[PDB]
Nucleic acid binder design. Structure first.
Ligand code: MG
Ligand code: MG
Ligand code: MG
Ligand code: MG
Ligand code: MG
Ligand code: MG
Ligand code: MG
Ligand code: MG
Ligand code: MG
Ligand code: MG
Ligand code: MG
Ligand code: MG
Ligand code: MG
Ligand code: MG
Ligand code: MG
Ligand code: MG
Ligand code: MG
Ligand code: MG
Ligand code: MG
Ligand code: MG
Ligand code: MG
Ligand code: MG
Ligand code: MG
Ligand code: MG
Ligand code: MG
Ligand code: MG
Ligand code: ZN
Lengths: 81, 50, 52, 88, 146
RNA sequence: UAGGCAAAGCCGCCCGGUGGAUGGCUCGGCUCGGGCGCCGAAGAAGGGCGUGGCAAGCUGCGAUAAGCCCGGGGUAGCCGCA
RNA sequence: CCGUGAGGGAAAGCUGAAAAGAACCCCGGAAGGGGGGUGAAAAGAGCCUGAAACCGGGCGGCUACAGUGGGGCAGGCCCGAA
RNA sequence: UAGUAGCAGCGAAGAGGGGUGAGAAGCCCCUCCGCCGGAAAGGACCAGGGUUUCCUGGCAACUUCAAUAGGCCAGGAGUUAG
RNA sequence: GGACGGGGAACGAGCCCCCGCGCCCGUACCGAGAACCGACGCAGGUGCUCCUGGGUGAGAAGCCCAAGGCGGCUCGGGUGACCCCGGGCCAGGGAACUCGGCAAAUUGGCCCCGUAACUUCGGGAGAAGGGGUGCCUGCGGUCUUGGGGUAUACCCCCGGGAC
């Protein structure tokens, strides 16, 4: 489901300040599916998912982790940071 | 438009992705034969009938 | 008024949109069929012998 | 830091501004002062620099009514540029 | 970046009132974020000129003159100022509440109240002083009304 | 008188600039002859969108996306146009 | 690419055998120029040959008191190697 | 034709000093001068357009002049809802 | 939403406290004298579609100035011939101009006075015609709006507003 992570300047500021990881998923993936995929794949807890479809045709999801998990820690653990 | 249908928006995404000249290595790879793309357009000159 | 001034009224309306079946800009949103392939008024593809 | 080598007081006459178009009179008078100082100080017109108080005096009554004459102080710097300021 | 665009939104003023000190020309090209514009505003190199309010001294002086009766002659009038319809509403309300109070207290009988109430509606009385003068003169009530 | 002796301008040749004719070339067309001849609800043809490390178009392919598996041919290179 | 649409619809081929695709030096803000190189040949990527129209320069003849183009004869100046 | 027409008309317009830069009337800053202010001009926003938005850098082409400017070119980023 | 009826259970609220869930698509920017349409970075059209402070003013008129924006209706400088486009003034005469008072000019707001033939009795009518109009110093009135006086109107006092 997940295609990649967004490590732009905006996405990195979000990870340190709002505990949000930004991902690119399939265009048909819903908020229920994105929260299930993030929890299953990484073993964390998701508070809410904000999703948008980019002007280039992709779906971007701002996944806010619950307040026991570090958004930057998961980025640095995956090695995508 | 401010309010879009997703089908119309996706076709604009396809046009946005393709609007770009060939990369500089392609020009060197083809010995300056491939220099222009037919999917290149300007928003003010050529209008999509999306 | 029929020339340049009336051309300014063609900025916000539409008669046709993109057809799902043929992909052309020929789907009549009021008549509800395609003026190119006939989708929506004919299940067989519209094509005439007088047209090359 | 630049040093002064020559100071003069001049009374520039701007009566010629009443013979050009009314919509360019204040800007025209800037050209008169530059050409006046270039002639009398023996420099080029681009070497002349106008003080702020002189510019406000020229534009005090908007673009159409510059003053008929100006009393100015001309100063020539050590490097060759000339400074013109309104006498005050 | 455009510093005046950022600085105007920090200061909460228009871009036409934002002033950048010419001494800070070197530091303009380095500013990247709004935090960098916040540093310069604290240092005083970026401020906002106070806005102009139209002065009202001439108006306030002129308004006292107009209250005394100056500058309202025939040559200063171009349209309708006094409201003819609105004047009638106040004319009936002044005269009706005066007459109704008098009858309510008892100094005017309902019979004599009726003729005056209809005379008020019929435009007989020019103003309240005329109505008081008529009531005092003709002795329509036992005690004179002030 | 005529020449040294010339303005602007005119004609011819040569060189240069512009231009893309000509000539040569040809993995393209055209015509003719022979063959072969149906595909689709087991979801077709057609279209949209997507897919390459750097890739915009064409070509191929379809989230397993210039590709995956098996066998036969082919042995030393290969990663389309490029 | 054109038309709301039914529909309509171009222009556009060539380095060299091999990139050996121009090292290095001076100048220029840069495109780039000069010198110097590669190549049988610049054929220099704006790339085979490269015409005419056209424009610039050199050369030859004329040129400010003489009305223009074509032909014949006569003369001046210039070319007249094959 | 020709370095000619046009780049006036429709009630706004520039100037001084400094900075950047190879290069500055035109780019950035300040000061002065002006135009709109129930709006060819301020605030909001529909359709339509579709990345023109933002940042960085740039100036071969585009902008009726210039340019170091840019809705242009190159690279990267950006649209979060009970 | 309410009422009016029928049926059912032994539980139980429209009140208070507490717990859980709310998917999908749009969301940048222009919105136009350069982001739309008109081949254009086009004086047209679409959309001035909705909204906006002070002074003068009858006024959402015009003029000046705020808030806010702009000098980008994207050439600059000099000269100050004729001629052209747009604008100002012109003695004496006053339509003699010309197809023709075309064009220009005159009048112009408000208040007071006044107003004909004719008429479908409504009108004509702003008919026509005449007069006034600035600024300054005072004196008044009609109201209105609060507060204080015994005090709901009136009357007295104080502050503000309009004519
Ligand atoms: Mg257009
Ligand atoms: Mg219709
Ligand atoms: Mg007055
Ligand atoms: Mg009435
Ligand atoms: Mg000559
Ligand atoms: Mg297919
Ligand atoms: Mg050639
Ligand atoms: Mg010979
Ligand atoms: Mg001209
Ligand atoms: Mg001019
Ligand atoms: Mg004006
Ligand atoms: Mg103004
Ligand atoms: Mg107005
Ligand atoms: Mg507006
Ligand atoms: Mg930029
Ligand atoms: Mg921009
Ligand atoms: Mg672009
Ligand atoms: Mg959403
Ligand atoms: Mg927005
Ligand atoms: Mg324009
Ligand atoms: Mg302002
Ligand atoms: Mg200008
Ligand atoms: Mg006269
Ligand atoms: Mg006559
Ligand atoms: Mg006559
Ligand atoms: Mg007339
Ligand atoms: Zn169709």
């Amino acid at each position: 489901m997940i295609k990649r992570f967004v490590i732009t300047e905006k996405a990195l500021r979000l990870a340190e300040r709002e505990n949000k990881i930004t991902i690119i998923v399939e265009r048909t993936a819903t908020k229920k599916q994105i929260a299930d995929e993030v929890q299953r794949l990484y073993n964390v807890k998701v508070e809410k998912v904000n999703t948008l479809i980019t002007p280039r045709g992709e779906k971007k999801a701002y996944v806010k982790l619950a307040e026991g998990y570090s958004a930057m820690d998961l980025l640095t653990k995956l090695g995508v940071l | 438009a401010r309010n879009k249908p997703l089908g119309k928006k996706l076709r604009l995404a396809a046009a946005l992705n393709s609007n770009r000249n060939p990369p500089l290595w392609v020009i060197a790879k083809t010995k300056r034969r491939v220099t222009r793309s037919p999917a290149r357009r300007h928003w003010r000159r050529q209008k999509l009938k999306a | 008024m029929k020339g340049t001034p009336s051309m300014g009224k063609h900025n916000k309306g539409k008669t046709h949109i993109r057809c799902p079946r043929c992909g052309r800009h020929s789907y009549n949103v009021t008549k509800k069929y395609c003026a190119s392939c006939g989708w929506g008024r004919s299940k067989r593809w519209r094509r005439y012998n007088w047209a090359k | 830091e630049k040093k002064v080598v020559l100071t003069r007081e001049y009374v520039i006459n701007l009566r010629r501004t009443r013979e050009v178009s009314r919509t360019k009179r204040a800007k025209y008078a800037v050209g008169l002062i530059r050409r006046f100082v270039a002639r009398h100080l023996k420099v080029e017109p681009k070497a002349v620099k106008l003080g702020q108080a002189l510019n406000e005096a020229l534009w005090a009554r908007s673009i159409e009514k510059p003053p008929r004459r100006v009393h100015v102080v001309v100063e020539k710097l050590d490097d060759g540029t000339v400074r013109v300021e309104l006498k005050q | 970046v455009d510093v005046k665009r950022l600085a105007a939104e920090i200061l909460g003023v228009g871009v036409s009132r934002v002033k950048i000190s010419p001494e800070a020309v070197g530091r303009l090209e380095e500013v990247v974020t709004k935090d960098d514009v916040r540093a310069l505003i604290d240092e005083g190199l970026i401020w906002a000129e106070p806005e102009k309010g139209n002065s009202r001294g001439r108006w306030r002086e002129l308004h006292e003159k107009k209250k005394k009766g100056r500058r309202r002659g025939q040559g200063s009038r171009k349209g309708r100022r006094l409201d003819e319809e609105e004047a009638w509403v106040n004319k009936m309300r002044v005269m009706r509440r005066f007459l109704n109070t008098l009858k309510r207290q008892g100094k005017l009988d309902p019979a004599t109240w009726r003729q005056l109430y209809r005379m008020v509606k019929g435009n007989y009385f020019r103003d309240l002083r005329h109505l008081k003068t008529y009531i005092n003169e003709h002795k329509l009530t036992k005690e004179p009304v002030k």
